[PDB]
Amino acid sequence: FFQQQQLPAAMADTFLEHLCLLDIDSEPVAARSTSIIATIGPASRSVERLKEMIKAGMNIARLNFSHGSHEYHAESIANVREAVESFAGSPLSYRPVAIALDTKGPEIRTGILQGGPESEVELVKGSQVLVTVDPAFRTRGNANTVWVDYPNIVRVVPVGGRIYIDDGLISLVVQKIGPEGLVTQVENGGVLGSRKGVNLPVDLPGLSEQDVRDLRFGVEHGVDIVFASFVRKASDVAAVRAALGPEGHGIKIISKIENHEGVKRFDEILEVSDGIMVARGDLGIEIPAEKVFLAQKMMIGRCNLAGKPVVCATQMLESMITKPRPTRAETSDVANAVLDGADCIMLSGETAKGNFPVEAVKMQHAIAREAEAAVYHRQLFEELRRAAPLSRDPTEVTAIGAVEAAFKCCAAAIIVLTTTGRSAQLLSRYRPRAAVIAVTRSAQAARQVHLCRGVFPLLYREPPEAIWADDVDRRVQFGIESGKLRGFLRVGDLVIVVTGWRPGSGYTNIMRVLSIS
Amino acid sequence: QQQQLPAAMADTFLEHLCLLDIDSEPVAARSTSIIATIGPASRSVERLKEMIKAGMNIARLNFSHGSHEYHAESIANVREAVESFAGSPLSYRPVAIALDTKGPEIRTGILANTVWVDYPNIVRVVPVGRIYIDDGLISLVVQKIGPEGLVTQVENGGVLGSRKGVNLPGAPGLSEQDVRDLRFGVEHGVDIVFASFVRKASDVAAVRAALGPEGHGIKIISKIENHEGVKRFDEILEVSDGIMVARGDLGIEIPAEKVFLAQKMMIGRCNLAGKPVVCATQMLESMITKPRPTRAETSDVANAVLDGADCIMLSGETAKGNFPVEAVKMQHAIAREAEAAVYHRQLFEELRRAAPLSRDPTEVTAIGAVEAAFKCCAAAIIVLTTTGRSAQLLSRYRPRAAVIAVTRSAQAARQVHLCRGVFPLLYREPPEAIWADDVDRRVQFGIESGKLRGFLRVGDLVIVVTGWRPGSGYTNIMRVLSI
Amino acid sequence: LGTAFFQQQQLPAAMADTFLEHLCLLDIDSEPVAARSTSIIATIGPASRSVERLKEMIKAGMNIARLNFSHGSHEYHAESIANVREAVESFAGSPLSYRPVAIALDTKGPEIRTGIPESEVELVKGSQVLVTVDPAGNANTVWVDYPNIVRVVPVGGRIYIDDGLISLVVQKIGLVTQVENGGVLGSRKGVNLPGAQVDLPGLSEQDVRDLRFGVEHGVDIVFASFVRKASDVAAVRAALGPEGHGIKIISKIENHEGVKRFDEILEVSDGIMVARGDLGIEIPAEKVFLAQKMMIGRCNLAGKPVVCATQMLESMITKPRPTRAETSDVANAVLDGADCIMLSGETAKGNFPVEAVKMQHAIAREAEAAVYHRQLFEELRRAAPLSRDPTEVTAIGAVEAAFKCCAAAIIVLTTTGRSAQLLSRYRPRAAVIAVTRSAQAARQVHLCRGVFPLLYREPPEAIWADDVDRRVQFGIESGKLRGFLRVGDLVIVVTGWRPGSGYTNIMRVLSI
Amino acid sequence: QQQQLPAAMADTFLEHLCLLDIDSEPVAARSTSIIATIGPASRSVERLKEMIKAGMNIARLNFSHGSHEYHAESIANVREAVESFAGSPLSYRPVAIALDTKGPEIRTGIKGSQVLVTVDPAFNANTVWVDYPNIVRVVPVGGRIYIDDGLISLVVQKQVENGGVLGSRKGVNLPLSEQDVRDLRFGVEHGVDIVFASFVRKASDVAAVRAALGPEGHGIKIISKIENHEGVKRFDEILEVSDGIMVARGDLGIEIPAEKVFLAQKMMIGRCNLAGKPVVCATQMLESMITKPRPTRAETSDVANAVLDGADCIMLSGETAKGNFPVEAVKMQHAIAREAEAAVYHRQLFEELRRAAPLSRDPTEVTAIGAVEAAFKCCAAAIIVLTTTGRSAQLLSRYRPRAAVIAVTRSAQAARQVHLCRGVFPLLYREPPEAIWADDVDRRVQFGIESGKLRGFLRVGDLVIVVTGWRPGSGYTNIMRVLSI
């Protein structure tokens, strides 16, 4: 109890008094429920660096298949698994880490600039720039002319349209459509390098030939999660599932909502996906920048309703690419994503290319811990309660009973046994304040539950005891011992233990109140 | 749907009222206990058997009249009728016996105008500016305190005043008779005591001392009957097992149009504390003479259940009326409809937030069990309990599912009738050698009894609440089961 | 606000954040105000017919006099109307304390009456009994005033007699029955036939003459008995004619069909009466409170008056004090949201008609202070649709303003009563003092909870704005004299920008 | 469906989130005021006119830098740009001038674990100088001291957290000066409207500022900047004596841990909403737009979440003082604020504000809540209120009505000062009083209707709520009327 983890604010009767009672001297618990996804790149590739990021709090390593070869990414996977497994010799402190593959998706990139792949050229504001796809001008990239790697570009944009280059920094307005070149008037000028992104706010297919190879690669190397780029409809997810094949039927598909189409068809995309990523990078270019927060809050709420994980990504701590501490806007954005109900937060260039990858992970860890305590659980739990339909599934029934029991005694943890992760996910979807300590024998499940907020996975490695009830108790004790070592639990704490009545997944039906001795 | 389910789910209380349907039949068993007063109309063994089948749960002995031998016959006939069903343990219904004390009574003198009372401090307790006599018929105001006594100015005329009851509004805990009657109740093993005229905490402490250590297990229900008991209600409730709103005397001691305020205040505070509350007096008074009640009486019973009362009482309707069995049936039918019409959505929400954080594993398991019951609309919550406390902590959250309580204690089985929603089952088998099998047996006994009595069907979901070791106070386990 | 002021009117329970805490804070020492908002309808009969008796009940608080046309001739009811109006107008010499009293006509409706004169036949239970269509009554057979009764009732059907006290069962098959419940049988009592569809016309030909009588004598309200469908009321309005177009029609819901078709009945009616007497026989007694609470809530949603009637204080027909069930029934009807409460035999035949009125007055005062206005107002305002009518917009603003300062009253000027009813629609705690020049509006607004009508009798001032202020002042002086207002009280004043009905649009905060 | 009405009507906040629509366009004037700091990028009259048209409502003078003559030039340029629109009174936009005090600053002098700092006037990467003479009594053996906006830190040396390039004269942090007094006197002389009081730690700091403004600065609003741990702890006593609060995340983010700043922001905004007083969110809202034409995703959400929290004002610092896109940054804040104001869960916000607002017998307070309720009942296009000091407009703004509060006033100062209150749009009435007072009241009401029609607020057929008083002078507001245009 005490005056810690914003408990006075949690006991408020209105959201207004909740805000009034928030305290900067009320310290949070050590358990951080929002998972951190860190992108792998030249700054976070060495085994030595990855060990620091795992200790700092990185839960999922993201491989961005828009850059680098299959051989390059196989080296990233090997270095991650080498860093993760160096801690395995101490099972009570072992932290599982998931590997996520981010697909290239339907991209449009420019041509290499004349003079060198590492030289610059400027565009004049209000000038006249010609956009061409002619194969001859592929290496002619200059101030007056730019090449695009998308042939069917002249038959999609009307007169007066808009073409964005380099993360929406450069803007071109279509004036006339010419024979073998698109005449534009620059609307927003700026420096332009080589082979930058192009957004067109399309007939490029939903799943490319190269992304098919990329998905098979992820199955052969046993990735746990796929981030599918530019998901526009349900069949875009089915195509990714089909390319994964029966070999990868257990891989979680997280749909990236990156344009107006994805937001419009969100309901049909969410029903067929395991989760959603709000990809505010491209989404900030495909729809007006002042509206991205609407799309993020909408998508987070509907995922919290559905009980499916949602990832918030891009530019959360962007200034930390070059500076050791973030701006006030960036700290508030991470805190507010946690407040909205995000299950995971992501770092992109902050860990891939920046000079402070470990410090960015440490900052997200510190912010999320404070923000999680500031969640107004009293109204959140009540609303998730009413919105969720009645259930005859004993796992779901037990889950809500355990969460309510945890709120009643301010339990330090809910310890649940799970093989597939489902029992921990059904606890997570009701957003308990107590940490959900999930003890599993499945290494894959231990990595995959990082998607669900508040679930701390522990990989159990011992062969079964001869009496199953003894094997259950040993696993519960392993969760308590790990919680003690990691600082989640102390003597005298109350804990809720969630198990089933028989071995095998799907039989969870028991909730017990235990005190830590 | 049935059980007024469209109304119980409504977003607002106004929409809840709008959706109440007279064609939505009640399905759950009725959870408000019926207390019937024993009298000439309900003293024979065969009539008591009729009233048990009609839904009587507690037999009230009114010690305001009758000799000790008279009440011993009442106890023997009640126990004979109750035990005639013990041949079928799966359907046996325990019936509590409650002793209602006579309490301190100020009566006038025997043998004109300006009478005297046996209470000698009447001159000191009534200041200048009212005294009611004989059920409130005569009313006197005082305008001067002199050495002879009071002035006795007549405000309302009246007659018939030989040793009649005196009430003084606005202004010991146990008479010698109550001490003897309370000893009788211990020696005859009564389960509940209705302490009359409780106005402070020391009053119920004196009842406790008269019961002695031999009667430590008896429940003490404090009857609030005057203005002082209403204003010191918080201190009274703290030391009592429950409260009875005694509207009869309360309606004389305070203005009759204020009694409903006292009733709703006390029921709310008892609901808040998780303690049983009894609403009593003239609920179906016209049925003393007529076979059907008035519209006000039928509304009165329903509103007492809606207010949150744990038990409703019948006085002359069963003690001396011509339709004692029909009066019990009428209370049963009304209570069933009223319980389904409870706006359960706001009730459970408010009880949840008002109940404070607790680290007691029984309290933690209880709220988890009630939440789990709502999530699957479980047919019942089966709980094993030695003293009934585990079943009372479930009842305090007013679940819709029945709380089926399996106990070996015959006294605790009778006493849990005070808590709304608790259906006691008396287990009679001797303990198994291994304790975990004894627990399984009792849980299955509650299942099989629930199946016979229409509580449970094959395919239903039930919430079972047990503990990790024998003895009371260790409840900590909640399980979801299918029948 | 003054701390002593905060201790009355149950304001601590009003400020509670939950209904549970609202219950826990109710205080028997918290005294209410003198202004009771729930109107009292009293049935006129032998016990309440003398002019001197009507005077005592006006002072006791009777607001609407009910003529029960089930009994008595037109000449009987004309003398009743004359006596009521004489007692009412006897107070008109003092305008500031004049209490308008509405006259309500309760129709006979499709009734069925047993057989006869003042002897009494007891009836044995389980004795075979015949019901008689023959115009050619003992314990073995009795006759009835319905020739087509043999056509409708099936074998194994139930017939009720004398407030459903006696129940006949057609054990074999006029109809030879055997008795389910036996009792002392009077002369010409009531007969109810639940479940069986009767082919009796909702507007009989005697009903048409009674409604014409009410229009010719200028009654304000019609209680239409046994309304089963929307065109039952359209028939009543057609019988009233263009002359009776201003009479309020209250539909009495008395049987299962009326409850099932309640929504279409409410749409064409000015209000609803929960007629618990016949309802309690036509449907199981255990379900009446479900029907009462359903209709009160739906009327409160629709903003139309609802009356609760029958056996509220029934023991007071013979006793000077009611039972504890009766006092809580009145209180709970007010707590449910009823606009009006009714007395039947308590004032028509009983020995304590004035005391019954006084008892209902005292209970209503206590129960009105115990309403949880916080949730009631929030739910009424959330359920009411958005409006572009300035009268509705001003009304909700004035009620909210009255809650903010615990205003002693809302003073509204109204000619038709609509501005007062829209204020009453949102259930303010403050009394709605309605100043009107229309004597009929002053009578009919008693249907709306919380509205205290004042009849203004002066010719207009020549500047309309001054004429508005004189009526506001008349409202203030009247409230001061009746105890509703004191110096230093805040009052909300609701008026319009121009004369004529329909232009209310102004709310003002004034100190007394 | 427009302006997020499906989201605003929802029965639960969770359903409100699910119903937010990127296609639902805002159809309502922007209610959150924009404060732009004046500096080299925004001193020219031409740039100030573009920023006025872009949405700037308050011009901030940072007295941390620049002499009195530099700031007099800034005031003159702002007023010349503002008064350039006075030719059309129906569209004239008042702009307030706010003085931001220097406060008790500590600056440095004009890598390796050993570093010496000393206050010696006779004293590179090895030795730096500071201006604070003594500090040896405030720091214990546990605390630390920060250099250069928190980038370089040192514990009780008696060189942690790295520390890169350090320049000449940058801040020093430690987790009423004579200069401040002459600055506040300067502000009274030049008729500034608002004072931002730096580093307010207790209620007596506010009394000192009010004393330095003299009896001639009675009408100047004092906004207290909560900048450190003590200001957060004694917040309630500071709020009670201030006209408003600024959450100064810049310094606050160094004085307390950066991860805790959002907690302090939400606490102060909520308490200010409770007390009905204006609160400003400040510093680094759109920092990247100093060098880039478009903001980061974090910055867009940060401005939107400040509005959703309930801030009455949002601030721009280097984005408008020194950046390369000062007009575009104002345009961006205006655009984000409009979208976020429609996304507010008005159903629960209005309910919680009304139940938290205590009962009152003041007729202005009673009229205000009646008018806001009336506005909700008809979706009034606006609430037109006549006011001399602005108090009647502030009492309406307290309840956060959906309708715009059009405040008509003769006081040029009050017109500028009500910009601190969210949803208040001031109009300055210039005509002289009519002979009959009632005609002068109606003509001001019609002035607000005419101005509202020209600006797009009002439209023929719309319903409006008009709030007036019964006698001249302030404090007598007591009338609410429903009118058709």
Ligand SMILES: O=P(O)(O)OC[C@H]1O[C@](O)(COP(=O)(O)O)[C@@H](O)[C@@H]1O
């Ligand atoms: O002088 P009049 O004609 O009585 O009008 C005064 C009142 O009539 C009103 O229009 C209200 O009347 P209604 O309630 O019948 O609509 C207002 O203008 C004013 O309060």
Ligand SMILES: O=P(O)(O)OC[C@H]1O[C@](O)(COP(=O)(O)O)[C@@H](O)[C@@H]1O
């Ligand atoms: O908001 P404030 O400062 O209290 O001013 C409100 C005042 O404006 C008025 O409407 C007009 O007053 P003036 O004619 O003096 O400008 C007064 O009735 C009212 O008291």
Ligand SMILES: [K+]
């Ligand atoms: K990608």
Ligand SMILES: [K+]
């Ligand atoms: K009738």
Ligand SMILES: [K+]
């Ligand atoms: K400054």
Ligand SMILES: [Mn+2]
């Ligand atoms: Mn992308």
Ligand SMILES: [Mn+2]
């Ligand atoms: Mn008694």
Ligand SMILES: [Mn+2]
């Ligand atoms: Mn009838």
Ligand SMILES: [Mn+2]
């Ligand atoms: Mn600062």
